[PDB]
Amino acid sequence: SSGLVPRSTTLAIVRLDPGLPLPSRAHDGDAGVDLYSAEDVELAPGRRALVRTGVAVAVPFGMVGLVHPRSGLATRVGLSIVNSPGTIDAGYRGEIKVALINLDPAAPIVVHRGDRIAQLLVQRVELVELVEVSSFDEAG
Amino acid sequence: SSGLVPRSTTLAIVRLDPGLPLPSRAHDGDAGVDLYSAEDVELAPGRRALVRTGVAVAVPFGMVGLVHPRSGLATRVGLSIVNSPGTIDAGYRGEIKVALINLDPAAPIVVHRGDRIAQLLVQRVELVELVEVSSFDEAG
Amino acid sequence: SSGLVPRSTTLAIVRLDPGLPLPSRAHDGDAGVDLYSAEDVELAPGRRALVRTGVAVAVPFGMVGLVHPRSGLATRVGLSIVNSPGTIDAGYRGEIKVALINLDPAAPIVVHRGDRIAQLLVQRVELVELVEVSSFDEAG
Ligand SMILES: O=c1ccn([C@H]2C[C@H](O)[C@@H](COP(=O)(O)NP(=O)(O)OP(=O)(O)O)O2)c(=O)[nH]1
Ligand SMILES: O=c1ccn([C@H]2C[C@H](O)[C@@H](COP(=O)(O)NP(=O)(O)OP(=O)(O)O)O2)c(=O)[nH]1
Ligand SMILES: O=c1ccn([C@H]2C[C@H](O)[C@@H](COP(=O)(O)NP(=O)(O)OP(=O)(O)O)O2)c(=O)[nH]1
Ligand SMILES: [Mg+2]
Ligand SMILES: [Mg+2]
Ligand SMILES: [Mg+2]
């Protein structure tokens, strides 16, 4: 039933931390799969941490993985991501790590192992070929 | 004249606040349409607010809406967006709300109703099917 | 050998500052080309600067240039980009300028001319046609 592809893209994933659920789409059509923290971390205002997600992925060639902040946590507690959107290259086989930062002025954020701390989107990217010109009239 | 599609994608939009202009592209080919604030809000340094834009959209299935900061305000006054890029899912029919934050150290930002506070892009996204493997040799 | 396109997209680029290397992909398949600073700038905690990259590009119509923070600098020193992801429109022929900000609480960041301070991705974008509806049942 499920196994039939209705009228993929696939993303190979390794759970380096098998104790965490696989990243999942909260709903049908959702752009991102939620990434989990493998760890407990407390962020004082303005502090940042490179947080392990416990997964590694193989973004297809011609694509990019993008790590985006979750909007609820952003608003509620000022949780953001320092390098957002995080750029995961096709060639990267390492653990996805999220550079969480507390952008609240005063209140610490506690992240617990098992919390959803970001979302991962996958998009095609143009692997551009640079054409250097001395001015734009010239390139056309 | 206009009505002829030259050699769409369409985006259904509801102005929940009809007193605001429709989001518009500043120029031909611009990636984003500018979102307006429905409200007056003042952000002290480091403060954030979830600001109503007065619109709801229906991002097509297979796509994502992305809320990006405007570069002028970013530079001039340190206005950013906490969860940038804001991720609008295909299924979302609620009001788009922008998590504005003042990243200036010292100077408050006043946003007025009618100000352009972000930009909305629409892109295709890969709705990936996760394939869990025990290691990447295996997935190929 | 090289010159043969194996089984482009091209991006015209002008080095307004010819003393800087052309933006390059660190590796095969990398989503972004790294942008360089044309300038020396020191950012105290919470300060931001609009930094010249010494390049101008012609993003193809139907596409967008996106300026993303580099993850290493984000983590190591709290370097981010205020309007990230920076949105470069197809029509823009000006110099790409990066709104760097120091999100570290306490330690200044020194950027040197020649340092890689961001990455530029190019993606297709949907140049959407807005269709205003009074409610979403109506648009379908
Ligand atoms: O900038 C934004 C981002 C999201 N949204 C809305 C649309 C999006 O589909 C919805 C959920 O976005 P996120 O998934 O980033 N938020 P979160 O994961 O915290 O909530 P949920 O559990 O509903 O996904 O919130 C906005 O109005 N503005
Ligand atoms: O990081 C950036 C972002 C934009 N830009 C340039 C290219 C882009 O096409 C142009 C406009 O970007 P935004 O639309 O984000 N800025 P804003 O809306 O404030 O100005 P405008 O009214 O010109 O659109 O600024 C940069 O040089 N660096
Ligand atoms: O949020 C992120 C971003 C990147 N990464 C990993 C995957 C990506 O392919 C790799 C390199 O990303 P960047 O190019 O943004 N970092 P940087 O340019 O500092 O290092 P490198 O010289 O390796 O490219 O780091 C993460 O784990 N999380
Ligand atoms: Mg979500
Ligand atoms: Mg603009
Ligand atoms: Mg890199």
Three-state secondary structure readout of C80-121: EECCCCEEEECCCCCEEEEEEEECCCCCCEEECCCCEEEEEE
The b-or-e profile of C8-30 (16+ CB within 10 A means b, else e) is eeebbbbbebeebeebebeeebb
Q: How far is CA C54 from CA B115, C41, C98, C101, C113, in A?
A: 31, 14, 11, 19, 10
Phi and psi angles of residue C110, each rounded to the nearest 5 degrees, phi first:
-105, 125
Q: How far is CA C132 from CA B5, B37, B57, B116, C135, in A?
A: 18, 18, 9, 19, 9
Compute, in angstroms, the gap from residue C9 CA to the centroid of ligand 4: 32
Give the whole-angstrom CA distance, residue B35 versus residue B24: 8
A21: number of Cβ within 10 Å = 12
Give the whole-angstrom CA distance, residue B124 versus residue B118: 20
CB C52 near ligand 3, within 6 Å: no
Question: Among residues A12, A16, A59, which one has the least CA distance to residue A39?
Answer: A16
Cβ contact A70–B84 (<8 Å) = no
Nearest CA to ligand 3 atom 10: A88
Smallest CA–CA distance from A103 into chain B, residue: B46
Q: How was this structure determined?
A: X-ray
Nearest to B123 among C61, C91, C125 (CB): C125
Give the whole-angstrom CA distance, residue A112 versus residue A67: 19
Pure H helices in chain B: 71-77
Query: How is residue B125 written in tokens?
Result: 């996204």
Would you list the domain boundaries of chain A?
1-124
Query: How is residue C41 written in tokens?
Result: 């700038």
Phi and psi angles of residue B75, each rounded to the nearest 5 degrees, phi first:
-75, -50
Q: Residue written as tokens 């939009």?
A: B13
CA-angle at B35, arms to B32 and B37, nearest 5° = 165
Ligand of minimum distance to the alpha carbon of C48: 2
Chain C residues contacting A via beta carbons under 8 Å = 8-15, 22-23, 25, 27-33, 56, 58, 63, 68-71, 73-75, 78-80, 84-85, 93, 103-105, 119, 121-124
Reported resolution, Å: 1.8
Give the whole-angstrom CA distance, residue B97 versus residue B65: 12
Render A62-105 in DSSP notation, one character per residue.
TEEEEEE--HHHHHHH-EEETTSSEEEETT--SEEEEEEEE--S
User: For C54, left (φ over 0), alpha (ψ -120 to 50), or beta?
Assistant: left
Q: How far is B135 from chain C (nearest CA, A)?
A: 20
Phi and psi angles of residue B119, each rounded to the nearest 5 degrees, phi first:
-135, 145
Cβ contact A8–B140 (<8 Å) = no
Taking every pair of C-alpha atoms in chain C, what is the biggest distance, in angstroms?
58
Cβ contact A122–B135 (<8 Å) = no
* Cα within 13 Å of Cα(A124), Cβ side: 13
Give the whole-angstrom CA distance, residue A64 versus residue B69: 21
Give the whole-angstrom CA distance, residue B31 versus residue C65: 9
Domain C1-124 has CATH 3.30.930.10: no
Compute, in angstroms, the gap from residue C42 CA to the centroid of ligand 2: 23
Smallest CA–CA distance from B78 into chain C, residue: C82
Instruction: Please say whether the beta carbons of C96 and C35 come within 8 A.
Output: yes
Phi and psi angles of residue C75, each rounded to the nearest 5 degrees, phi first:
-75, -50
| CA-B116 nearest atom, ligand 2 | 18
- Cα B97 to chain centroid, rounded: 8
Instruction: Please say whether the beta carbons of A104 and A78 come within 8 A.
Output: yes
Taking every pair of C-alpha atoms in chain B, what is the biggest distance, in angstroms?
58
User: For A97, left (φ over 0), alpha (ψ -120 to 50), or beta?
Assistant: beta
Instruction: Please say whether the beta carbons of C38 and C14 come within 8 A.
Output: no
Give the whole-angstrom CA distance, residue A60 versus residue B68: 25
Give the whole-angstrom CA distance, residue B67 versus residue B60: 15
Instruction: Please say whether the beta carbons of C84 and C56 come within 8 A.
Output: no
Strand pairing class (B79-81; B95-102): antiparallel
| E-assigned strand segments in B24-115 | 33-36, 41-43, 48-58, 63-68, 79-81, 86-89, 95-102, 109-111
Amino acid letter, C31 = A
User: For C46, left (φ over 0), alpha (ψ -120 to 50), or beta?
Assistant: left
